[PDB]
Amino acid sequence: EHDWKKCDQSGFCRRNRAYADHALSAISWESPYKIAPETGSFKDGQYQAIILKTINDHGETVRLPLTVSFLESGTARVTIDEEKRQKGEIELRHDSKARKERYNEAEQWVIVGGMTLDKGAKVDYEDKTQMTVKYGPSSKFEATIKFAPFSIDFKRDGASHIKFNDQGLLNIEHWRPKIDPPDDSTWWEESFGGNTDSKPRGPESVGLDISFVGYEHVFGIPSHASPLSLKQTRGGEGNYNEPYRMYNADVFEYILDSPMTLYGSIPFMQAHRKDSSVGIFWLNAAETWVDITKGKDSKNPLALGVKSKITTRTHWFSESGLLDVFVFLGPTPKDIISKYAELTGTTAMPQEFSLGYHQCRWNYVSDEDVKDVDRKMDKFNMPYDVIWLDIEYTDEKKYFTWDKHSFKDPIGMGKQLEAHGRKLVTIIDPHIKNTNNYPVVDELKSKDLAVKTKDGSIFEGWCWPGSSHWIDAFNPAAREWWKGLFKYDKFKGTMENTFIWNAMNEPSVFNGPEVTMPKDNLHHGNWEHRDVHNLNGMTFQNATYHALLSRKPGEHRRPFVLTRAFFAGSQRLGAMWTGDNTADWGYLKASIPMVLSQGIAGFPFAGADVGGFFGNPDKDLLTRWYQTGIFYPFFRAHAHIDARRREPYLTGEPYNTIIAAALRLRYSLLPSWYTAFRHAHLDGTPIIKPMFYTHPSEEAGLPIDDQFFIGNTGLLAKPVTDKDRTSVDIWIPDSEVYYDYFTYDIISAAKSKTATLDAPLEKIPLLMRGGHVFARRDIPRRSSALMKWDPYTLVVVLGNDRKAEGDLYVDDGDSFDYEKGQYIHRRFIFDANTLTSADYEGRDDKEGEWLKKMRTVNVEKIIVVGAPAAWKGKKTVTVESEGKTWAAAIEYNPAEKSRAAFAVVKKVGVRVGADFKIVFG
Ligand SMILES: OC[C@H]1O[C@H](O[C@@H]2[C@@H](O)[C@@H](O)O[C@H](CO)[C@H]2O)[C@H](O)[C@@H](O)[C@@H]1O
């Protein structure tokens, strides 16, 4: 039975909430923080200065240095530190060796670019009340710094969009000694969950109010079982009462519709309205809470006599470290997320197989179980790419071992899978069993690679194996060590098709407070665990990522690693999933806003356990779950140890047939999924896209989180996620023509609206937007690897303009050769009765081995949906490619009831890597 801190039980949460209550209550609250104007200098894209915080009635002050940066991107950055702790002029309690300064290495872990300062940014106006800086593209952005009381105001297009400290909630808890008097009851030791945090530094939280001016919707800060449009947190009907929490934790049977923390945290929030978008990124690795309220601008937000325009007020606070925030002014969603990704990284190029279907449970119990499941999937014509081994494969929960009784020949199991280009994934968690005759633990201790307690002893606690120690992946040497442990000749029973799953990396500690480590544990650098908690997961995933780059000499290849816990930047390192969900309809429905929130926070490679993890889903739920799951960028079935076997072939008819069809759709679209990952790699474009992203001009889109577009395809999905539903209402975003993917029925033309669509169990509700081209592979195979050289079908979807565009990206799916241009990237354009293929980047024609072999690979088929009538009774198209011209057969099919006119060209016979031109009509 799990115990979680509510705000009031977290000391620094209580104090910041109470500081907010006081400020909103008080008459003429002023933030007791001022820039000393004469400390101010602007140079070379950067203001620096000293804020003075007034700490008492007597006017005594402390010095907090302020750094405001204006980046070339047109992002700004605001940092506040504490001068006394920069200089070491404090004393820790208990003779702690913990670092005196404010944690300042989050940047190091997270930021990989976009830091170049804009020398074209400049002071427009100054005096000794305030200064305004102009920055970003042709100086369209303004920041007005106010000195007294400190505030910042971020503007563009003649208005404030984001304000810092307008409510006067700035709070840097300055260091103080523990002294009896000449409410401090949460300042020092705090007890929770069987543990007492010694709290050697005392109070050190950082907080700020950030207002989004004229914005009614905000989004991000995953992961939460919450809508995509975030709720208010200060009570009221359909609101929460607690702030949103980010404190990566192992939350057994986490509930729906809640601001409680889950397993990963990305403190990035965006605000969206019609044709305007902004956002912020709160770069802090400590426990972080976010309150959100919405109302009028007046101090009483329900007052009469004022403008009705809504502002969203947010109140951010973290336990320790710097106050460090980035500000994005957009003005589109695409802009914001694109800039965020320049800072924190784009999605890594994935292993192509990892977009396939993954089959998992706790546990497959032998190598015979695995090999039998493999054969059963082929027998029932259910394609999949990966079979997964959970923790029972180990020798008594020791990582880098196998149970010999149960897994006799892991190499042989390996090789059966390799017969179909399939892969094996095996779990490795960060806890190392504290036992005898275990070289891994000996090396961990002796090399000093383990996480430590508050007095420098090696931390010990309980997880799967019993007593355990934890690798300290913040330590570069622990990462270098770890890399060694995964070589094929070192990690026996693994081979080239073996990849890795990290869980329990929050870290999960069974006997620990909130199932994690004490706050006063110590890491490499002597940082407290409180400083770095939300980075821990990602440190561990990073270590594992780099271990898979090269596992034998001459190997250099893309890792695939699934993580449970994560942070900003984890997108560079692999996939995630939403942890231990439950086999129930509510969880299926909730999966979609969660997965969407992931990608709009820059970490799109995301999914939830298909079927739900806890319990036994009914057969219709499981079937629906496959129909949703084929639209997760990470698509894996998984099941708890007490759950019945539910490998998909066990479901029974008619469900087997329906689930097989879902799988085949996923596989057929694999070329378009892969292309969407490509874009995610190139500029952080989400893989599936909410309406607010694709249609920033459509106000009615803002709260919608149960449908989405796929990549660049124009495919609009809305899976059924309610019990016994046999139809679905799809919001049509705009006036373009939308076609049923299966029948080509015209659903809407001409007008935005809600359209009703037949949706029985056997139906996947999926629409094709006019204006788009996308590629698929129609030939069914048993895995993605066996699709590698099959021909493509292009679908050209036309509206009234009879124009479209789309794209296709391909490469070997495995190497870093894409970095030297070993790839095919096609842009397809439909215009004036002509489909053309050109290089996406406009490269001229040096061919490696994969590219050479692609010469045998063709577009063989083109389907045109919404074909124009003037094609009626024309029997050929003209095809040109690589100097050669020919005719190919086309059949035109006239419209018929609500079904569209379409046309089909078979046997196109043009190689996918070359320019081409096809003239219709
Ligand atoms: O490795 C086995 C599973 O571990 C994790 O799940 C846990 C869950 O199964 C349950 O037993 O409770 C503990 C404590 O909260 C959880 O950590 C993974 O999330 C799961 O995917 C694995 O199958």
Numbering used by the authors: 33 to 214, 236 to 898, 902 to 977
Text taken from the publication that reported this structure:
To elucidate the two-step enzymatic reaction mechanisms of GII, we performed the structural determination of substrate-bound complexes of GIIα using its inactive mutant in which the catalytic residue Asp556 was substituted with alanine. We used Glc-α1,3-Glc (α3-Glc2) and Glc-α1,3-Man-α1,2-Man (Glc1Man2) corresponding to Glc(G2)-Glc(G3) and Glc(G3)-Man(D1)-Man(C) in Glc3Man9GlcNAc2, respectively. The final model of the α3-Glc2-bound GIIα refined to 2.40 Å resolution has an Rwork of 14.8% and Rfree of 19.9%, whereas that of the Glc1Man2-bound form refined to 2.30 Å resolution has an Rwork of 14.4% and Rfree of 18.9%. The α3-Glc2 ligand containing the scissile bond of the first reaction of GII was accommodated in a gourd-shaped bilocular pocket. Two glucose residues were clearly visible in the electron density map and were traced as Glc-α1,3-Glc. The disaccharide ligand binds to the pocket with the nonreducing terminal Glc(G2) residue interacting with the deeply buried −1 subsite and the reducing Glc(G3) occupying the surface-proximal +1 subsite, explaining its exo-α1,3-glucosidase activity. In the −1 subsite, all the hydroxyl groups of the Glc(G2) residue interacted with Asp443, Arg617, Asp633, and His691. Additionally, Asp482, Trp517, Trp630, and Asp662 formed hydrogen bonds via water molecules, and Trp415 formed a hydrophobic interaction. In the +1 subsite, the 4-OH and 6-OH groups of the glucose residue form hydrogen bonds with Asp303 (N-loop) and Arg617. In the Glc(G2)-Glc(G3)-bound complex, the equatorial 2-OH group of Glc(G3) is not involved in interaction, whereas the axial 2-OH group of Man(D1) forms a hydrogen bond with Asp633 in the Glc(G3)-Man(D1)-bound complex, suggesting its contribution to enhanced affinity.
Glucosidase I removes the outermost α1,2-linked glucose from the D1 branch, and then glucosidase II (GII) trims second and third α1,3-linked glucose residues by catalyzing hydrolyses at the Glc-α1,3-Glc and Glc-α1,3-Man glycosidic linkages. Here we performed an X-ray crystallographic study of GIIα to elucidate its substrate recognition mechanism. The overall structure of GIIα is composed of four major domains and three subdomains: N-terminal domain (residues 31–384), subdomain B1 (residues 207–256), β8α8 barrel domain (residues 385–737), subdomain B2 (residues 484–526), subdomain B3 (residues 559–581), proximal C-terminal domain (residues 738–823), and distal C-terminal domain (residues 824–977). Taken together, our structural data revealed that GIIα can recognize two kinds of glucosylated substrates, Glc-α1,3-Glc and Glc-α1,3-Man, via a bilocular substrate-binding pocket with a tolerant +1 subsite.
